[PDB]
């Protein structure tokens, strides 16, 4: 099953989609130049973009820290990317009051792994009908992704993206399963799957992130979820032609 | 460092304290009955008691299975609880607003294991003052315990519990590493921790506790059904107990 | 099911037996010295005991570490230690072609982890008729124990203990599931099941006897443990024993006092 | 790091080589079979192909499975093998004093992984001079295999291959570790790094596609793999074609590509 989302179909047998932004949202202006680079490299490179950011930080080093521009005054800054760039954008929700008026800014809304069994919030972002993204619990196998599926079907909302972040490994560690994305294509009504590379992972780091966005993507994925600043942004470009050359190739082999 | 619940003292040196009660809220009639057995086979037995139940339970198994009777009857029913046997009483809490009212009633606060890094949560929590029951979640690593401490100390609470409920193995499965509950105490201040064998998992259940309360613990934490069946608890309580005071009367013995 | 090794009794409903010793013989006086020590310690608590060490370290990381005083030398050593204390001893076998030979003398012959799916080395040991110990790999759960023994059955020798050693846990690291111990009990018969408290601390050392208690708590038919007075780090300190087993004699009198059910 | 096998290039940054074969030796005539449909399939499409399998298999599921026809004849089936087809072979050996007679005729000797950390195994399987292929056993990390490694590397030899099968994650499950083909390079001397699919996996088919394409898109030397028509189950022949179609189209894009820039 394909989505539409504006001008883009996000499938699994389609040219695959590029989700990325920033951590956190700080400042409006920092906000626009971030989505500027993104736009740029992928529009050479003929990739379809969406744009990500968290308007809060939840979990924060210090009771101190920085959290972010909040809810208010993060809506702002993506209402402004959406006119300045004219692209979707996507960011998580934490609380079942904030779903409706997130909803109303952001094209897809994110459910956070450490909250996809809090049944209340699944009520509430399925309540919007806009498009869902589920991050998949790093304790949850593949062939459970079908129970949230369920609870999002029951509540009414099938516009539903599963999302790969790892699996956990011993303690403080993670191992992704190739194995993990078909068992959830095969299970879950053959709805896009992408793969977070970025929290997946923890020159090396830059080379580590490269093979195992090549191997996710080998086994035919809507779409690839990614940050940058941790991958700088020359190679962002270079990541990418060799990301796209991979996923021409798969996605013209029948299936 | 121990812990004063009225009159109880929770430490990872003292007698065991069982936290034991019911998954949900559900009804006041019932509630109450089964809270009546605890209490009558913990007194003749001695062992310090307090009574366990949700009054929100989120993550059920449907969307629309009853989630429990709510904040305030929840509140209510805890009243009752209170009056009726004189004993303590602990609940979760999942929203930074309900942090008062539920502190107000409820002698131990519980930080969800899906909440347990929510600064927010956590900042809230902190500032009732409250004994706070932190849930490890099965992600996490034992030595990330402390980091979950540190933000409670910043925020002016130091009255902690840390309970264990299993580490993820492999996928839909857990195991309990016992040697997490050392690692805890050596990191984290020797603040009481206490197993919760019900969430971690019957024969099962008593190996299991068994096992646990071997390594020295604080208190045993779990949920019955008229989960244990309520009717094996006094000869489940009796053999913990049995263990517990054999451990607990021989000092501890330090290897290099 | 119970396993007589000379004057033991050896059960999941006995009083539990020390199969105690070090990491590998060096000599004959160091061996000595250490068997009296923990020989005069386990009759004064009324402990059975069982005397361990291997005679070769067949997996070290260098073709140039120290193995110990090898085969021939190690069964001389065997001798006398069973000649002067009169106690049953147990070791390692790596190569089907020792087997009949270390069980003219060692009581018990131990199977290794990494092995377990040899099938030659099965078929060897069972056929010396001698009691086994198989160590459950790192890699194999405790309801696939079973094959294992399935395997001794079909050739022949039922005298088998399950010696719980530590599963894999990521990359690098070892926990014990104390569930399956029980699993292990309900699945191949009620075979005497032994903890393995020294490798199963492997990547801990300061954590030894709360791991030791962990698991005689689930009523266990043995402790299997190595001193020092070789390693990843975990043997114990050797005049910490008369202690150390004061704690877990203390347990394990307890948890078997108590009717199963 | 590249090895020559025969005429075969084998190196991480070199045309993928397949290897595959049957489980155990019985016959010269049913050897000869199997090894012909391989051999047509990867002719067909231009792979490089060494066959494999044991004369004397150590580990089988139960006591009185056959163990292959021995060492005298396996070798004399493995001579016929070469002789006909002209391509290189590979087989496990289990006791030391087995590993010279076998590298007389065997291009590629096999350390199973049950015995990876096996010193005199380890010594005598070196001394042979041939290429080795080291299993990685599902219990070790990708920086421990930098141990065996050296072990041989002391004991005299530095042709090796190093072998992926999966590890282990929790209860039974294996998961291949895709960042492990990376670490294993990097700490190892880019030694050429191959891919055991079968194993990895203790319809079947769709599955053993999916991960082997995911593990060639890391840049690996070659790839493990059982077909035709015991404890792991082969690949359906009738696919075998199609299968390697797929994984040739991946690795040649891919080792046509330069590795990043610094
Ligand atoms: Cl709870
Ligand atoms: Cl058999
Ligand atoms: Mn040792
Ligand atoms: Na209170």
Redo the contacts between chains.
Sequence with gaps: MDIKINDITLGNNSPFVLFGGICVLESLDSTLQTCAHYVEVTRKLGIPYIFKASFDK???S???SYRGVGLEEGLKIFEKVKAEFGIPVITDV??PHQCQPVAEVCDVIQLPA??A????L??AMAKTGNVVNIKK??????S?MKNIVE?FH??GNGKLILCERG???????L?????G??VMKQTCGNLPVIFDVTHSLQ??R???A???A???????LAGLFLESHALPLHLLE?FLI?IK??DD??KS?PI
Aim: proline share 3%; hydrophobic share 40%; charged share 20%.
């Design positions: 939840a979990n924060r210090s009771i101190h934490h609380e450490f909250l069994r809090q049944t209340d699944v009520v619990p790093q304790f949850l196998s593949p459970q609870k029951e509540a699996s956990s490994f011993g303690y403080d560690n191992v992704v399963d190739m194995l994305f078909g020159g090396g830059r080379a580590q490269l093979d195992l090549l191997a996710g993507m080998a086994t035919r270079d060799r050359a991979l190739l798969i082999q």
